[PDB]
TrEMBL record, chains A, B, C, D:
<feature type="binding site">
    <location>
        <position position="62"/>
    </location>
    <ligand>
        <name>NADP(+) 2</name>
    </ligand>
</feature>
<feature type="binding site">
    <location>
        <position position="19"/>
    </location>
    <ligand>
        <name>NAD(+)</name>
    </ligand>
</feature>
<feature type="binding site">
    <location>
        <position position="89"/>
    </location>
    <ligand>
        <name>NADP(+) 1</name>
    </ligand>
</feature>
<feature type="binding site">
    <location>
        <position position="63"/>
    </location>
    <ligand>
        <name>NADH</name>
    </ligand>
</feature>
<feature type="binding site">
    <location>
        <position position="135"/>
    </location>
    <ligand>
        <name>Mg(2+) 1</name>
    </ligand>
</feature>
<dbReference type="GO" id="GO:0016491">
    <property type="term" value="F:oxidoreductase activity"/>
</dbReference>
<feature type="binding site">
    <location>
        <position position="13"/>
    </location>
    <ligand>
        <name>NAD(+)</name>
    </ligand>
</feature>
<feature type="binding site">
    <location>
        <position position="13"/>
    </location>
    <ligand>
        <name>NADH</name>
    </ligand>
</feature>
<dbReference type="GO" id="GO:0008206">
    <property type="term" value="P:bile acid metabolic process"/>
</dbReference>
<feature type="binding site">
    <location>
        <position position="155"/>
    </location>
    <ligand>
        <name>NADP(+) 1</name>
    </ligand>
</feature>
<dbReference type="GO" id="GO:0046872">
    <property type="term" value="F:metal ion binding"/>
</dbReference>
<feature type="binding site">
    <location>
        <position position="192"/>
    </location>
    <ligand>
        <name>NADP(+) 2</name>
    </ligand>
</feature>
<feature type="binding site">
    <location>
        <position position="209"/>
    </location>
    <ligand>
        <name>Mg(2+) 2</name>
    </ligand>
</feature>
<feature type="binding site">
    <location>
        <position position="190"/>
    </location>
    <ligand>
        <name>NAD(+)</name>
    </ligand>
</feature>
<feature type="binding site">
    <location>
        <position position="159"/>
    </location>
    <ligand>
        <name>NAD(+)</name>
    </ligand>
</feature>
<feature type="binding site">
    <location>
        <position position="39"/>
    </location>
    <ligand>
        <name>NADP(+) 2</name>
    </ligand>
</feature>
<feature type="binding site">
    <location>
        <position position="38"/>
    </location>
    <ligand>
        <name>NADP(+) 2</name>
    </ligand>
</feature>
Length: 251, 251, 251, 251
């Protein structure tokens, strides 16, 4: 127990699915957690479902909102003390080829998936450096950050950007002895109530030519690698990509 | 000779350095070439320096300008007939860590380096598919698309995006039998009049801990791999990364 | 606590340094452990230093010895019951360029580093498949499995082989529902009594152009990622490379 | 024409398929070529089919034969003058999972695919360094050097080894100003009389879930990238992987 003793984590998109499992396991391991989401109705209920206000709170925020990031860090420090841990998990998807991607779809997906991760990473380094917190920025960077998908053009762009921008941040933090690590987590297909809402999606994702294990993962599969990366167990890991994909990228 | 017989190429940022060497070798191999740049004074002189208007022309264009891409394809087809070949070479750099990157710098660099490559790739697929041209989109994607640099945060983001968005486009074009290939070229440090304007830059780039060959490359090093990728010699290459870096990424 | 409840692990080269830290953390998390080494004098003392014979024992074995692998699996099952977990950690190094590598050095290093990992992986799949153990093969595959070192030619060959042979094994195990996962761990430079015996080694490894964190790791850094991979926490991870290198490969 | 003016190349397994296409294009571009194979009957006819003895000769050799490499370099220098160019192309395949691989199959495949490439690379550096030849070692390293195949365990081991051992050699040659470059070529599935002898193979390889272009390549696809890498056009490329796979590894 207590693998995140004393840690203070922000988890973007922490009210559902992968983000909620990360928040749940973070609280179970002794972190204080601020989860973000778009909808107070979902977010407040999610926080209460996991624990008490001394353990977990909700902050309504769109990760694309630059000024809101300031308010989010300030609210988390007011609630829990200085932030040690940021999981940039909030993301959206557009099911279009590059050929069929409208510029509106392109800009909207990059605002969340790329600007959001940039804004959170930049502010995280500024607020967490040089405080002896054992600080950790975990960027959600997808198997779509390693391989293309013909129907996820803008998503591929965003996840490749997060993958290599995270290495830049990791290096600067390491060279300057900031006590901040930056790593990416690369989920394969994960069962979420959302996947459950797309008829035939889980079966298509489970075909051996997609996921060799012949089934998709579960939110806890991503939560456990995030616990490792938030913990001081991973104090020599920075600038690295952690893939949990049932073998998708191995073939 | 004649390795690009009958090809019609657009080269963005083709008036200087790497882009001009690509344009020069493309014309030498029998392609018709439209080069783009920001400044008619530089661009018109560059085109005339390489060949006659039947071989090479200039089109003034900022790669971030979405509507200008339409005019650029229309001008190239009017001059030379249908476009077969696009080199997305235009790029800018910001020498900032992620921590120190202003949002203005972030948006300006992504407008050229990421939106520009998206706009050119999307329009290229639409205009070049299903015409039996042996069409080839060559995206400039940098060693900074493989490894971080602590002082090139936004540049790293842009080059990782180009790397994996190019794989998406390659796959969609391959699966749909579009007769369009999409590949990335990843230069290491290359001597340009620009590098020459930064005192100490070439020496720093030439240190064995950076470039193991102990010197930097020249624009022709990038021109020759682009000739291969534009030619029908590379008709089975798509979705691949071609690195020419004096060993930078091998260590 | 108890993250390896009920697991039965073999750790090759488990009597010193990285392997001993993996054995120590495995026992702390409730695994039964058989450690191997060449020297009974070191191995027996190492096992007793960690725990009781019901928790940890020593088996004298050179990982290059094909027939000894049979005896090692049989001894582990006799002591602890069916084997769930194999860490192929035993390795040797030759400090020669490819140019200067003698064929004797080549064959000796590949016998331990490649044949040993093959023999253990092959026998592990045969003995651990289809038993509902949540079986996990963790192959030690080095940052030298990603990048070259001019003075580690044969070592580079061995670690690249382990990296991609492990993906083959992972895929076959996944496609056949064997309940066996196969992953590689890629340490950067780690402080061991051995590194301590090479004057100037740790300082050279700690230079920012080598390890950006400006120091090398410790055996526990490798132990903690191995606990994750042995545990059921990583039940969706197979065919993946886990890098813990202080940023070595990120630049 | 004349892209390999004055080059003297050894191509192992140059009597059939990929190696013969590389030899053919090398001669067409002005190289003198020694091709190797196991069978004088095939090899002598192959050499005569391509050109005159001043252009191309055959040398009977198993790439696993260490002493024969000495005789091969000596014969090539006697025929053509000092060797500038080595293509380590000779290889064999075993269609077994790691689980099902016999130790005999393992040792036989590694003798050709790994020892052969080591022996040729080591001797190539020794004989070609510091002679101003613009020397180039091209190691055949397969898409099976990037991704696993559940039924090519030993082949995966060999191709991952070649991939990263080649980076070691490239770095040492670059750091020591040897005038020797070392790069790997990674074919996807290529139509050879051999593939033609395996009923259903080409169709299985052509499925969109394997090769997105929906067909396999031809030997000339590998010949053209080898011409680039042998030529002085690629004088800044070392330690790099060149993939020609119809999109296999992009998904
Ligand atoms: Mg409480
Ligand atoms: Mg003319
Ligand atoms: Mg590096
Ligand atoms: Mg006890
Ligand atoms: Mg003649
Ligand atoms: Mg794949």
């Amino acid at each position: 127990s207590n693998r995140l003793d004393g840690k203070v984590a922000i988890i973007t998109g922490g009210t559902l699915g992968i983000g909620l499992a990360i928040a749940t396991k973070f609280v179970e391991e002794g972190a204080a957690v601020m989860i973000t989401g778009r909808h107070s109705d979902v977010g407040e209920k999610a926080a209460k479902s996991v624990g008490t206000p001394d353990q977990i709170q909700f902050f309504q925020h769109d990760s694309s909102d630059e000024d809101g990031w300031t308010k989010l860090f300030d609210a988390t420090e007011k609630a829990f003390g200085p932030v040690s841990t940021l999981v940039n998990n909030a993301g959206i998807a557009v099911n279009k080829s590059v050929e069929e991607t409208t510029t509106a779809e392109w800009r909207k997906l990059l605002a969340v998936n790329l600007d959001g991760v940039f804004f959170g990473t930049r502010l995280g380094i500024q607020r967490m450096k040089n405080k002896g917190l054992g600080a950790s920025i975990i960027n959600m960077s997808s198997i779509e950050g390693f391989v293309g998908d013909p129907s996820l053009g803008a998503y591929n762009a965003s996840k490749g950007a997060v993958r290599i921008m995270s290495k830049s941040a990791a290096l600067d933090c390491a060279l300057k002895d900031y006590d901040v690590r930056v790593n990416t987590v690369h989920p394969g297909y994960i069962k979420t109530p959302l996947v459950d809402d797309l008829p035939g999606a889980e079966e298509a994702m489970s075909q051996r030519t997609k996921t060799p294990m012949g089934h998709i993962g579960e939110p806890n599969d991503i939560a456990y690698i995030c616990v490792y990366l938030a913990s001081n167990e991973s104090k020599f890991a920075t600038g690295s990509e952690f893939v949990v994909d049932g073998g998708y990228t191995a073939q």
